[PDB]
Design a protein around this ligand. Structure first.
Ligand SMILES: [Mg+2]
Lengths: 172, 333, 99, 417, 246, 47
């Protein structure tokens, strides 16, 4: 159709010789993940894993922000309208993408070139390679919004040395 | 006339009985063909003129002295594939393929003399094209001689091809004296029945079965057999190593396991053995597109011919200069 | 390198008799700033990789045949550092095999 | 084999068995009433089952005429196998090569059963593993083909179709890989004498190394030696240099590759002028190919045409290119190149078209494995510049894999779309 | 413990003694692989006699599609085999004795003396013409399997070839029985004259893609719709919107 | 020869097509590929 021209702009693809890069380009929301963005990302990564002409995949972000987490305003307005189905579908799509990232058959590399919050770490930290820069800032302020560090953040924070996972998940 | 074409083509393209003198000539002709094949590295005209002219001559002889170059030049196509596939649907060619007759000139004489029917109507057009659905038969007063000659062709075919060269590689004169006794047995229906039900032909059949099995190893058949059965072949070695560890850390079992593993390793790793003895050339049956009932005899066309199943004795590398076929896919390409 | 199986004859004290290598090298490491030898041309002719230090004024015909360029001025200290790093890496990999 | 007396025995037994069955059926009928008009004069004189009696009379007459040697072999009639021309020494060397490997294998399995210590048992197990992984190792492609054949015997319908096509492709690839592997020394020859090659090269390598150490030591002791001893060391060094030169000559054996066809493109007489007259030599241009995408060429000059062809034949395997083909029968797209003043056009064609080319282009395209290409040589038809333009054209084709890597995008055949 | 080793040796001996069997079924599968769809086995005359019995007994259950699936041949060959067996029994009823079949049993008992090529299913011959499309950079999507597309092409060509065979074979069958003239001196006028077969031309007379609508117009002044034979005549003379397969 | 590309890609295509036997250095180059830098447009700036 023609209505998905905004989603294809929100999740761009750059192709190289044997590799593909997914780029987050939602500068209004600081690259916050919506349901169509997660659906497109899941479709792209499934097709790239199936393709034997692609060696490894990438995930980048455009702007000063890598990914500011999930776009919760749409879920808030959906919960205000009574039905809870939209939030549900967004959540199993996001956790399905995180599970795909954790079990991915080819190498995957994330370039973290800015602020990473919430599920932004959840789509990248289960990957095989992770590149951090001097602009990379990682925080988990889910307790200060009334929510919990989901999207696999209870997997990798709990495996940090000592009790640093608790400090990060409680203080943000 | 026709034996002299062997001197032109340096091999037995004539298909009648050779004398002693003609066999002595063929020895020298095949020596010439061997010395020419070694000489091909230093020949500028080998591909474009020599091999192509010899292949075209062989194809003309194969289809009953037809002008193959002229008729193919009538079409504007470079490759011979559609031309040869169209030739296989001719009425005289099909009458040769069904083994209702022995040569193309016999078939042309029978069709021209108004003695073969297509869909119960007499058709005297030797170049007629038969499409799928056509029914071929003979005349009612003609079919009994055709049945007798078809039986004679098949039984003297087994006696003159499958018995002379398969394990009875006898010298010429004593085999010619021996053929009288073999011909007397075919005089009766009881003799043909008893030759069919005999342990002689059963041993010949079993040896040819084993011989056809051995030729499959040139394609790496035994390696595919090992690849199918990799897990249990490994499990045999796991069992041997487990037994030789457990029952040794503190002997018929060891000898039995060693004999089994060595038998399996020999059966799966032995290379293909191409022996000195020449392969017997077998009569082909056109069952991919022609359905035959040899009792009357009658036949029905139900499909189209195949470019890889035309029974010419031309090598693939020579004939590829005319066909230009991507061989190996099974298609008419 | 391209004619390494050619015969050689002893003459005198001379400039000393040396034969070519018995095995063809799998790599050539070159320190030829003034291009006094035909090493890069013969190695490119024989499909052998070349590790060399490249000056700013290297010709395109020589630069095209250098598989592993190292852009530097070939000072004594840099050649020492280059060779020390090469030596240490080679013998650290070689000690990992029992050798 | 089967004795001819055994054949006479079995045919006489068959005729006897015919007579015994006839008399037994005659007895069974005649005891139960049943007159035997269908037994007498219906299996004896008026059977005529094949119409073979005139052939018997014709053969009987031709067997009582001439004399020769009755057991003399002659030339066969249905001979001309024509693919039975392979050098038998390599094949009878394969047999005892496999036999020596198998005997070594049997010896290690018998040594594994003769151990007493599990440290020794583990050591001989690792020796067996290193032997089997180097001499009795099955290629992984055959494991893929075996798994696919396992799925195929229980497949039906669309799956049976698709698996048959996939295994057809795999069998073609493994046959090609086994026939044209450069790592197998069985895929090489000698050329006319101008693991056995492995060890005969290793012994010469060790001899050359020993001679080089000896030469270095003698040059070392020559540097400090003056007088007649210096001359004696000089003569000793010259003898060592002669030995090393001869041993270096002995390693230069040119090899040809099996499964390749080599063809002459051009043999020319060239000339040079001196004060004594014209000096005439021959140049030979030749091409080679394995019909599977590998093509090469060489040009040589010698005193005679035969010698020039021989030098080019020895040189022809030293510059081999790999050419990508589309579906093993044509080029991916239309290509136009020029080398000097020779312009070459090549056009891809569908699968029943054929090769439309002049002899130089046709020979090179045939040896590279193409089947359906149209071509045109425009301008100069210098055969050597034509060869070079053909190689320039075939290396400038951009395959769908090349486009896919160059642009970072998926390239699809249009009929699969 | 040693009983486990004995069962392991039994598991090894049941395989090693049956290696030659596995090589035999592998040879048949190799015949099917190297020529895709080739059935690798040769169909015997006794199997065709059994096919004729199963068709004559229960034609509603043992149909052409079922007999083709069971004996792994094409439906065209099933129709041909059934016609030839019908003719064989008509000839043996006219003769009074069963026909001689020496050639058939020589072919049945010793198939290894001969080469056969009898096919199971149809594989289409593709013009492997290079023609490519570059997808967009952000294309998510799955390329089709070329074996799947080859299967669909082959099945379409199989359906076409089957119906063309059916039409030509039924026409030749009732030419064999004697309902088609085919000889110019057997085409004679009736006592009232000639029947005609009148086709309606133009866009307003079309019966569909294939030609115009037809009626008969008898010599007595009456007209009638087409018969079944006349319907076959209509169907066989239509233009076909394809190139010639085989 | 007439093949295009650098040493690595040309050697990969030759080895894959079974034209040349695999050299010893081919795996060492594939493990540590020669370095690549972006296009620079050739305008060197005065420091
Ligand atoms: Mg001119």
């Amino acid at each position: 159709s023609a209505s998905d021209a905004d989603v294809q702009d929100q999740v761009s693809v750059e192709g190289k010789a044997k590799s593909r890069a997914a780029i987050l380009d939602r500068p209004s929301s600081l690259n916050a993940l919506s349901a169509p963005m997660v659906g497109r990302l899941k479709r792209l990564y499934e097709s790239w894993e199936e393709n034997p002409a692609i060696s490894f995949v990438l995930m980048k972000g455009s702007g000063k922000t890598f990914c500011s987490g999930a776009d919760v305003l749409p879920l808030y307005h959906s919960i205000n309208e009574g039905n809870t189905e939209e939030c549900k579908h967004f959540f199993g799509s996001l956790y399905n993408f995180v599970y795909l990232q954790g079990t991915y058959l080819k190498p995957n590399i994330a370039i973290m070139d800015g602020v990473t919050m919430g599920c932004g770490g959840g789509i990248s930290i289960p990957g095989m390679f992770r590149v951090a820069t001097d602009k990379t800032v990682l925080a988990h302020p889910e307790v200060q919004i009334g929510f919990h560090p989901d999207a696999g953040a209870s997997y990798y924070l709990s495996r940090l040395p000592g009790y640093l996972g608790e400090y990060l998940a409680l203080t943000g | 006339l026709r034996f002299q074409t062997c001197r032109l083509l340096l091999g037995n393209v004539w298909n009648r009985e050779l004398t002693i003198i003609q066999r002595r000539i063929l020895r020298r002709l095949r020596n010439r063909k061997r010395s020419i094949k070694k000489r091909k590295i230093y020949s500028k005209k080998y591909l474009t003129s020599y091999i192509q002219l010899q292949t075209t001559r062989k194809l003309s002889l194969f289809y009953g002295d037809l002008p193959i170059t002229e008729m193919h030049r009538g079409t504007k196509r470079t490759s011979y594939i559609p031309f040869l596939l169209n030739l296989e649907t001719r009425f005289d060619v099909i009458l040769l393929r069904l083994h209702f007759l022995e040569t193309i000139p016999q078939a042309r004489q029978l069709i021209s003399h108004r003695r073969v029917c297509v869909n119960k109507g007499m058709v005297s057009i030797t170049h007629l094209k038969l499409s799928h659905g056509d029914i071929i038969s003979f005349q009612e007063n003609n079919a009994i001689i055709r049945g007798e000659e078809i039986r004679r062709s098949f039984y003297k075919e087994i006696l003159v091809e499958k018995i002379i060269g398969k394990l009875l590689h006898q010298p010429l004169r004593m085999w010619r004296r021996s053929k009288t006794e073999w011909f007397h047995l075919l005089k009766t229906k009881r003799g043909c029945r008893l030759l069919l039900k005999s342990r002689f032909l059963q041993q010949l059949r079993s040896s040819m079965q084993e011989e056809d099995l051995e030729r499959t190893k040139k394609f790496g058949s035994e390696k595919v057999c090992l690849g199918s059965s990799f897990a249990e072949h490994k499990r045999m070695k796991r069992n041997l190593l487990k037994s030789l560890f457990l029952s040794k850390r503190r002997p018929i079992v060891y000898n039995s396991s060693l004999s089994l593993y060595s038998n399996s390793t020999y059966c799966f790793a032995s290379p293909h053995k191409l022996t000195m003895k020449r392969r017997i050339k077998r009569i082909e049956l056109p069952t991919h597109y022609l359905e035959v009932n040899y009792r009357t005899p009658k036949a029905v066309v139900f499909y189209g011919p195949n470019i890889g199943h035309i029974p010419h004795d031309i090598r693939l590398k020579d004939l590829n200069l005319l066909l230009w076929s991507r061989n190996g896919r099974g298609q008419n390409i | 390198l391209t004619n390494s199986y050619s015969p050689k004859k002893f003459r005198s004290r001379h400039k000393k008799l040396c034969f070519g290598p018995t095995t063809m090298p799998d790599c050539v490491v070159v320190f030829d700033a003034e291009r006094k030898s035909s090493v890069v041309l013969e190695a490119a002719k024989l499909q052998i990789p070349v590790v060399a230090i490249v000056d700013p004024n290297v010709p395109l015909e020589f630069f095209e045949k250098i598989t592993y360029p190292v852009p530097a001025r070939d000072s004594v200290k840099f050649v020492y550092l280059f060779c020390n790093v090469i030596t240490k890496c080679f013998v650290a990999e070689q000690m990992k095999m029992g050798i | 084999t089967i004795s001819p007396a055994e054949a006479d025995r079995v045919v006489r037994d068959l005729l006897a068995e015919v007579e015994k069955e006839k008399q037994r059926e005659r007895e069974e009928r005649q005891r139960q009433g049943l007159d035997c008009k269908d037994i007498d004069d219906e299996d004896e004189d008026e059977e005529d089952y094949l119409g073979i009696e005139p052939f018997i009379e014709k053969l009987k007459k031709q067997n009582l005429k001439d004399d020769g040697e009755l057991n003399r072999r002659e030339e066969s009639s249905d001979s001309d196998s024509e693919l039975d021309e392979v050098d038998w020494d390599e094949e009878r060397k394969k047999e005892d090569m496999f036999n020596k490997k198998f005997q070594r294998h049997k010896e290690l399995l018998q040594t594994l059963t003769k151990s007493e210590t599990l440290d020794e048992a583990y050591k001989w197990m690792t020796k067996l593993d290193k032997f089997e992984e180097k001499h009795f190792k099955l290629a992984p492609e055959y494991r893929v083909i075996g798994e696919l054949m396992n799925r195929l015997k229980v497949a039906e319908g669309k799956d049976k179709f698709i698996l048959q096509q996939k295994i057809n492709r795999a069998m073609r690839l493994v046959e090609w890989k086994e026939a044209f592997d450069p790592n197998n020394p069985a895929n090489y020859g000698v050329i006319e004498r101008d693991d056995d090659m492995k060890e005969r090269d290793d012994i010469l390598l060790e001899k050359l190394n020993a001679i080089d150490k000896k030469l270095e030591s003698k040059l070392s002791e020559l540097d400090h030696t003056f007088g007649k001893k210096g001359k004696r060391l000089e003569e000793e060094i010259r003898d060592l240099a002669e030995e090393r030169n001869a041993l270096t000559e002995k390693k230069r054996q040119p090899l040809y590759r099996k499964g390749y066809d080599v063809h002459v493109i051009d043999v020319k007489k060239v000339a040079k002028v001196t004060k004594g007259g014209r000096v005439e030599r021959y140049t030979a241009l030749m091409v080679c190919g394995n019909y599977e995408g590998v093509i090469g060429y060489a040009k040589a000059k010698a005193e005679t045409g035969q010698s020039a062809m021989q030098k080019a034949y020895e040189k022809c395997f030293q510059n081999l290119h790999y050419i990508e083909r589309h579906e093993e029968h044509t080029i991916a797209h239309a290509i136009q190149t020029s080398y000097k003043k020779t312009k070459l056009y090549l056009w891809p064609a569908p699968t029943t078209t054929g090769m439309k080319a002049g002899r130089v282009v046709k020979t090179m395209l045939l040896l590279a494995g193409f089947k359906n290409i149209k071509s045109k040589v425009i301008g100069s038809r210098n055969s050597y510049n034509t060869v070079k333009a053909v190689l320039k054209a075939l290396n400038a084709v951009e395959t769908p894999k090349d486009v896919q890597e160059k642009f970072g995008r998926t390239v699809v055949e249009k009929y699969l779309l | 413990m040693i009983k486990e080793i004995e069962k392991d040796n039994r598991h090894s001996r049941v395989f090693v003694d049956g290696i030659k069997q596995k090589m035999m079924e592998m040879s048949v599968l190799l015949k099917q692989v190297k020529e895709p769809g080739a059935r690798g086995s040769y169909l015997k005359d006794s199997e065709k006699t059994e096919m004729y019995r199963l068709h004559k007994e229960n034609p509603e259950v043992y149909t052409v599609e079922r007999l083709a699936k069971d004996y792994r041949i094409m439906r065209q060959r099933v129709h041909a085999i059934l016609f030839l067996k019908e003719d064989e029994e008509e000839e043996e009823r006219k003769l009074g004795r069963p026909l001689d079949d020496s050639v058939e049993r020589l072919l049945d008992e010793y198939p290894e003396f001969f080469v056969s090529h009898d096919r199971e299913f149809h594989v289409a011959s593709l013009s492997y013409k290079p023609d490519f499309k570059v997808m967009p950079e952000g294309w998510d999507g799955t390329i089709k399997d070329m074996d799947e597309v080859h299967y669909e092409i082959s099945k379409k060509e199989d359906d076409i070839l089957y119906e063309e065979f059916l039409r030509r074979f039924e026409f030749n069958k009732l030419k064999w029985k004697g309902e088609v003239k085919c000889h110019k001196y057997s085409r004679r006028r009736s006592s009232d004259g000639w029947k005609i077969t009148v086709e309606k031309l133009g866009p307003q007379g079309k019966r569909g893609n294939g030609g115009g609508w037809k009626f008969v117009s008898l010599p007595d002044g009456s007209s009638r719709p087409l018969n079944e034979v006349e319907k076959m005549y209509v169907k066989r003379e239509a233009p076909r919107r394809r190139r010639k397969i085989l | 020869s007439w093949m295009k590309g650098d040493l690595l890609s040309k050697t990969r295509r030759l080895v894959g097509g079974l034209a040349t036997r695999e050299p010893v250095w081919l795996k060492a180059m594939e493990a540590s590929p020669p370095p690549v830098f972006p296009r620079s447009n050739g305008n060197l700036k005065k420091i």
